[model samples]
Target chain A: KHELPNLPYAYDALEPHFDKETMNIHHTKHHNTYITNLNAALEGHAELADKSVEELVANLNEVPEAIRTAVRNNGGGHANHTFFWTILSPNGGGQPVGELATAIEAKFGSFDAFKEEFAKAGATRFGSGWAWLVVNNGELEVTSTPNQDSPLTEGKTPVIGLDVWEHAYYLNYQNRRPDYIGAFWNVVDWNAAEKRYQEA
Target chain B: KHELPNLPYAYDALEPHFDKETMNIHHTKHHNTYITNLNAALEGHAELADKSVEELVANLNEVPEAIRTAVRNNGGGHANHTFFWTILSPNGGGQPVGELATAIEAKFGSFDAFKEEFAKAGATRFGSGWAWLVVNNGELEVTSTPNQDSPLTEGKTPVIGLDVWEHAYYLNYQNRRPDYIGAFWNVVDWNAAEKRYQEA
Candidate 1:
């Protein structure tokens, strides 16, 4: 089964910040579609299909450049979305706690400014990609990624993520991504983020 | 007189989401520091200093090649943050309304789908740059821009933006940009966004 990851909340639960229909097609159609093609690309290559995303991504030097892009992209799409679903939850909305919060003070100065900067990162990304909150080399940072790559391959530990993919928000926000970003606050599963923070 | 933009909410208001120290430095030191240098860059250049931000930005082709990088980078930092402050407010957060939402669904088929695509775009930008949700000729689509270029200079109306600039989120989120992107939902100012849409 080139299975797609299931979204925790019903599509509409994220609304009116995020809409229902967008979630359905995004999770079910788009993700599954990627998996389908990804599997097809690796149809006869059992060795490759069996490899973990991290393994494949880490060993990009050996793979052919043609299929390498596919595996990197679709494989990344699969892994990133899987985390995407878990990072959010219906009841998982709130702010950070513990040392993470302390770090916020030490780092960005305050949460509101952090929000402004983070949301600005989301709103300002110029094209198809993802926005992120990551821990890099011991410092906390906000960044955006294009296409299907994740911080996983980029030598960073992702604590929070915002998908800027057109499929992620276009259906509800149209070209108004800042609105999507603004609406994002109420639904943040900072609890999950905190868990990641503590673990990190 | 060059002055710093004060943080709107109390240092503690952002709370667990962000910390006081990071806010203090980001707004007072980091952002203001940029302003200080920007003003210095403009010092004694009566012709350039007199031009509005928009005018100078539009003259990218004519700006000194050596200074172009600085003006583009620092000038971009100024423009992006200025526009950023205008859209965020204590009251700003959640959902799209009126024509924006309806238009989004009509074009992208769903909101989650939109986010998926946008995040993917942000996730994959090859280097330090930005991703945009733009209104091109009447259609809405995603496009990536390298460095500090804005869509307005290129004749497109930018509705949503994300900064992959390293400085934007490095201190708090580090290299885990995906983590940063994941939590972006909590701080966006949708109400302020509605005003922008109206003007659009």
Candidate 2:
């Protein structure tokens, strides 16, 4: 019963920052393919369907051996992209506030410093993957993963995320990935992030 | 001393099929980044400098442990892209003739079947990497590797190569990877591929 979730806003909403065409194809084509494959992979495994993606991926060893990588990649794609769409908005940008802001300052020295570290995590990641600011054991940290991997699979709760996949930006930026990472700041939904932080 | 090699044909040579802008960035920026980083990774390992890129990747474990992955990724990028450029040309495409043709028929059953299998390798590959026609222990095979991995690391000698990385075709094809894989046939340099076959 898994399906691609609707984008929180219209395709053009991310606009001058994220571009309309990329958002449409990324949601309709890329994200949907992951959901389709995930459902296909989990077919016949009735016990797994009721579990959330977070629970399924975190306990992947319990899955049948043949389709474990399939579930991990496609399921991770489904989950990560779902979270990715939720945390970006036309009203995003700016900074996190309240306890999350205090925590970011305590952990990273400042929000801009957090940006530098997060950008490095995104930029320096060698291949297709993501950069994340996540909560691990009640502490905030920054990390990156390669190719459809998420912090959830590593036992951390991701709060803020940036997709570094080439399909995420290759159309607009070509080889200049840092420019795309810079543009990401202009549309990051700190309000949604605060909810994730509070929940974590 | 690693360096990006010259493109054998003009930037616009593969036009209408592969496009000029993608070629320029893929070669100048993406490929050069690998060369620069390959050299940086091998610094102070003068003993390893004399080894060819193929030799370095094929025998990667021989290199020091910490930088093995850096060399594998960047050096593999250097080798794979170097091979990728060599096997594409404006004068390319059409079926092979001679021993290579006979071998393809013997192994893959037919030329069209070979294309289907090779394209499936590219199409189904989960993330950044290549789909290859390689000579493995005197047998011809179609295979793929994940991000920056080369069949050479697995000790196979690739004869025909396609750059399935998103940066290789995203500007021209977006999420239509199968379309890009199809376009690859229009520019396949069978002449050079035959030579690689003979040499391998």
Candidate 3:
């Protein structure tokens, strides 16, 4: 059962950085479109729908190719959005706090370097996807997601993500995708990201 | 030869929508990084690099398994960016003013329908990949490229592309990707796309 994810903070609050219109389109028109399509695709496939998101992820190979893409895309969309909204807030940004802070320095050479690499990941993605700071088992790593995917599907916990699809920025950034990325730092809501880090 | 492409417009022009900082990172840091890495991989094999990008694409199975992933990632990066930079302009964006516009309507019901479906393709790709508006065997169609793969390798002409790849979005959207897809419309540069349509 797919449920609409609640934004941790109001969509408009992340602004100057992200506009309210962008958030609404992203959440309602886009993501909802995927969910609606995906659920319709699963019309009689209760087994797949009823399973936990984790189970669906684990049994990915067994999904029908016809609907495989849908499950992968929308399931990914659903799961990732849930994880994303839960871990963001209006009052985010700053250096990582606690053990994650130490780990960020240790793994990525420093918070700034980590930020550069991660942000760069967002900037350089060839199209629409995600750049993630993931912890695999006990290892800290950086990776990316295409469409709705996240490291979580691959059995990694994504502590952070940046959505690099064009629709996310064209309204504000136009063709200068990178400029939008730079603004992202100010709106990152690092505390929320840190919470995911702590919980994981 | 791996050549740095001249962007269709100046670095800063895409602004408010995209910032110069992210563009520098996107082009200089990210895109260049791929080209450099790709050349480094191809340096020892003149025969391979000598072959057209299409040739290498056709024989993907023959590529060294150890280096296959790298070649695919970097080669696709180079090939994709090579093609992408050509499909836009400051004067672009409207409706396709040529054969593509006609063909799109013929094949996909209408150009607007084509755009929505194309965006859907980008919006739906599973990970770091591309959603393409491709011309295969004289028919207009849509397909996707996973990671760095392109339609060129498969004898398909990519008239238009929406890079669903993550580096494209992460900085701004955080985890909301659909928002990025929506913005892609504003900056499409359809005139530039019309040129590609003529060539294809």
Please count the clashing residue pairs in each candidate, in the order shown: 116, 0, 41
Best by lDDT: 2
The window of 10 residues in a row where model 1 chain A has the poorest summed lDDT is A166-175
lDDT of 2 by residue, A1-200 (tens): 88778888999998888989999999999999999999999889999999888788888788899999999899899989999999999999987876888999999999999999998888898879999999999999999988888788778999989999999998878888999999999999888998999999
Q: Name the best candidate (by DockQ).
A: 2
| B79-195 per-residue lDDT for model 1 (tens digits) | 655665555444544565566666667778876676677777877664456776677766778777766677766767666666665444444554445665554444556665556
* Candidate 3, superposed: residue stretches over 4 Å from native: A62-66, B1-150, B156-200
Q: Is candidate 1 or candidate 2 better by TM-score?
A: 2
Model 3: how far residue B97 lies from native, Å: 16
Listed for every candidate in order, the interface RMSD values in angstroms are 12.6, 0.8, 7.1
lDDT of 1: 0.68
Q: What lDDT does the true structure give each of the candidates?
A: 0.68, 0.90, 0.73
Of models 2 and 3, which has the larger TM-score?
Answer: 2
* Model 2 misplaced regions, further than 4 Å: none
